[PDB]
């Protein structure tokens with residue numbers, strides 16, 4: 031009918047590409063997708079493929095895999111492997127080179143995708159709303175920039191994702207974000223990662239494996255302990271294991287200002303009065319939805335706390351305008367953005383409405399060692415349930431008894447609704463935790479009870495079999511009070 | 517005098533003896549031929565898994581896996597003088613002996629500190645349905661060290677390697693000796709397509725000297741019979757790619773020790789090859805003879821003791837669990853049967869072991885994880901079967917250099933209702949991934965339960981949540997595809 035496109039997707043990331051693909055393919059709709067760059071890298075960092083591909087999950091997993099070899103090389107000795115350890119060295123530029131080729135290939139893959147799909151078209155530029163049914167494509171983020179294209183459409187989808195949050199403190203311009211970290215030419219000998227979240231924790235491990243001769247990695251966090259939002263036992267254990275591998279963790283510390291010393295070094299003064307020197311300061315304190323450049327007021331789309339407000343079906347307060355992924359500020363993860371996009375396309379161009387359950391979402395932290403988690407943490411469950419039970423198990427994995435890494439304790443924790451045995455959450459710390467948690471993610475979707483876990487025969491020998499060996503709770507939570515059996 | 521007498525202090529035996537004395541306060545006597553691992557009897561207090569099974573082989577597979585990491589590290593910028601690389605078989609053996617020895621001790625410690633639990637060193641045999649004798653040897657004419665009268669007897673003698681009757685079999689070893697070799701063989705021949713043969717081939721392949729070679733031969737057409745055909749084909753390609761030599765439809769006829777101390781092996785086809793070590797891993801059989809079972813009249817069916825779903829034999833007060841029953845020879849299963857037996861005998865609730873949908877792994881390089889039925893079976897028990905396949909080179913293997921390491925995930929379902937009949941995996945961490953899905957099958961999950969779960973990204977396991985369209989089906993045993 032009138033309006034050239036059926037759907038206009040602003041942002042070619044995880045959710046955008048999924049949305050765009052389904053509508054053109056499954057429903058035969060003419061879709062236009064817009065993004066700022068064709069390939070990864072400065073100046074805009076993300077490009078076709080989104081954050082996960084260009085400056086997220088893909089590159090960090092390869093870099094984390096590389097860091098892990100430091101562990102492998104050191105531990106091989108416990109099993110009789112010999113070599114002249116004095117010739118060992120990590121070549122950072124090689125890592126960056128292979129990472130760049132891996133991402134570039136994905137960028138190309140998405141490009142040919144458009145070239146081979148009828149009804150799917152890509153537009154290079156910055157998209158913004160002129161009105162609720164007209165999207166402009168400009169040369170730059172500036173709203174007074176030249177208009178390259180003007181797309182009339184029947185439906186609009188906002189999938190601009192997020193961007194790192196730089197705190198307004200003196201000297202912030204001497205700091206970088208995770209964005210620049212992917213393109214460093216050399217690894218910093220002295221680096222400070224500001225933040226207690228997963229990005230900060232993951233990069234600290236990367237920097238720890240590739241740091242030069244007299245290097246030191248320092249992580250600092252404002253609060254009491256790292257990984258706020260995760261199970262307290264795992265937060266405590268990971269802190270010990272990271273420290274044991276040479277990472278200095280400064281909690282209860284908060285920068286006041288960053289000064290650039292004449293020798294190119296940065297001096298950081300904390301509110302405590304403590305002053306330290308680093309070669310690189312990286313801010314990984316949070317990510318914010320990118321709503322700014324969209325010009326949402328031209329359509330009257332409502333923004334709640336930072337992100338675009340949407341209902342359960344990803345619909346905004348304005349008809350024919352939807353938003354998915356990180357810009358909605360729900361659960362900032364790739365698999366969730368993809369699930370929302372596919373559900374949204376079904377609700378809009380399909381027969382049956384559909385929505386994404388944002389509960390019992392399994393996720394991981396690729397720290398060294400890594401974390402896997404699904405469900406509620408006891409602190410939250412105990413406030414929602416009158417009777418909660420906590421099953422805990424800590425042991426040294428077989429290989430680490432002889433590998434030398436005595437400190438690598440594997441922690442398994444299952445929390446349940448004691449009134450009926452329903453498993454509310456599973457939290458793991460230890461090697462392969464991210465691979466083990468996927469399968470249990472399905473179990474919670476099936477509303478499994480603790481009895482269901484221990485009535486399954488285990489695979490011997492593996493770390494995973496321990497989840498099927500927890501029959502008795504360690505302590506309980508009765509109306510928020512911690513209690514035990516005498 | 518004792519409430520229960522357990523013949524065999526292994527995975528199942530110790531499990532029964534423990535909670536019977538604990539949970540039911542019964543006086544238990546446990547018998548075993550050796551207290552520490554190694555020659556002469558190899559197995560000892562703790563059983564096969566602990567002494568010459570799961571525990572020691574797992575440490576050795578971890579050791580062999582480092583050949584992969586050392587090589588693959590180069591792809592991520594790790595460099596070192598690769599010409600100075602050498603593997604030390606004796607350090608590997610030294611550390612595993614330590615680890616095993618500490619576990620043997622841990623069990624001895626257990627008996628002293630547990631009231632009503634007593635260990636008797638030696639060989640146990642039935643004198644009568646209520647009398648058990650502990651002699652100094654497997655030969656029933658040896659000195660009776662102890663005589664015990666009990667109202668309950670539990671048989672858990674386990675299994676033992678099956679050495680074929682061929683000329684020269686005295687120049688061959690079994691998996692038992694493998695754990696104690698002083699130096700790694702230059703040329704080794706592993707006979708058998710089973711898991712023990714495949715796992716050891718990967719261990720020998722990693723610790724082989726300078727100009728070494730590992731050969732695996734199997735009578736059949738393809739290794740790992742009983743496993744999913746795709747995994748069998750794919751694993752073969754990957755073992756071969758790593759330098760392992762696989763000879764299918766070959767079987768040794770005779771083994772002649774020759775001059776220099778090597779062995780000349782002549783296969784049934786006429787092929788003749790020399791090896792420095794020949795390991796026979798063709799089978800495991802229940803140890804029932806030394807029990808003098810006819811002294812009580814307990815039935816034997818096919819090598820193993822005949823028992824019902826509740827592990828009771830034909831004689832009222834005698835039960836049998838574990839490998840000796842020839843059901844499913846795995847440690848977790850034996851442990852489950854033990855606890856269920858103890859309940860059915862000293863408890864209010866009769867309880868039995870579900871031998872179906874048990875997950876298991878093969879610690880080969882790369883490993884295998886599996887749970888449920890294979891399509892060859894499912895299409896015979898079901899009229900409409902759907903097969904979902906996913907093959908892909910993981911992210912890290914694109915960059916590590918090991919581009920041949922293809923990850924395979926296969927899901928088999930009963931297409932009439934979507935119920936998942938089996939999940940088979942090949943690839944790094946397959947053993948860890950399969951455990952969680954093992955629970956899913958006990959909960960009777962359907963394929964929709966898998967693809968409706970949000971994945972963990974990036975991981976190999978999320979691929980199981982992205983399979984939603986069948987590759988092909990099986991209609992009344994016939995393979996069919998949608999047009």
Ligand SMILES: Cc1cc2nc3c(=O)[nH]c(=O)nc-3n(C[C@H](O)[C@H](O)[C@H](O)COP(=O)(O)OP(=O)(O)OC[C@H]3O[C@@H](n4cnc5c(N)ncnc54)[C@H](O)[C@@H]3O)c2cc1C
Nearest residue numbers: 041043044045065080081082157190191355356362363364
């Ligand atoms: C360092 C890091 C590590 C991460 N690791 C993980 C992990 O391992 N697992 C996981 O699940 N998630 C991880 N994430 C998060 C994951 O990347 C995001 O949740 C996911 O990318 C969100 O998908 P999306 O569709 O919302 O947005 P995106 O993929 O971010 O796509 C948004 C797109 O919008 C484009 N754009 C922005 N504004 C405009 C405009 N006005 N006009 C045109 N184009 C525009 C951007 O260039 C970008 O390509 C990580 C994130 C970071 C940064």
Ligand SMILES: Cc1cc2nc3c(=O)[nH]c(=O)nc-3n(C[C@H](O)[C@H](O)[C@H](O)COP(=O)(O)OP(=O)(O)OC[C@H]3O[C@@H](n4cnc5c(N)ncnc54)[C@H](O)[C@@H]3O)c2cc1C
Nearest residue numbers: 524526527528563564565569570640674838839845846847
């Ligand atoms: C090389 C190898 C690798 C394996 N790997 C795995 C694996 O990774 N995972 C897995 O689940 N399973 C594995 N298994 C199988 C597993 O070890 C057995 O299934 C398990 O040990 C069986 O427990 P059980 O109690 O039935 O026997 P056992 O552990 O075999 O205990 C039997 C005990 O009886 C004793 N004995 C025998 N006869 C007498 C007698 N008359 N008097 C006194 N003592 C006697 C023996 O000395 C032995 O200690 C492996 C086995 C082998 C050989």
Ligand SMILES: N[C@@H](CCC(=O)N[C@@H](CS)C(=O)NCC(=O)NCCCCNCCCNC(=O)CNC(=O)[C@H](CS)NC(=O)CC[C@H](N)C(=O)O)C(=O)O
Nearest residue numbers: 044047048051083136139365368910911971974975976982
């Ligand atoms: N929940 C996702 C899981 C896989 C995933 O994250 N896929 C991303 C790719 S990064 C994706 O497809 N996002 C949306 C999208 O692109 N939709 C359009 C449909 C076509 C899909 N892509 C076509 C182009 C082909 N290349 C890629 O998609 C490149 N992707 C990858 O390389 C991703 C990393 S983001 N692989 C995986 O995450 C696989 C896991 C890996 N094998 C491991 O072992 O770790 C899903 O269900 O698809």
Ligand SMILES: N[C@@H](CCC(=O)N[C@@H](CS)C(=O)NCC(=O)NCCCCNCCCNC(=O)CNC(=O)[C@H](CS)NC(=O)CC[C@H](N)C(=O)O)C(=O)O
Nearest residue numbers: 427428487488490491492493495530531534622847848851
């Ligand atoms: N989960 C499987 C069974 C796993 C298993 O084989 N467990 C063995 C432990 S060796 C066992 O307990 N067998 C029976 C038994 O021992 N019964 C007697 C009563 C309880 C006390 N037994 C333990 C004595 C102390 N020493 C050890 O337990 C030393 N064990 C280990 O080191 C074992 C290997 S057999 N680790 C595990 O079994 C756990 C896995 C390992 N941590 C990993 O990293 O993968 C199942 O039942 O489904």
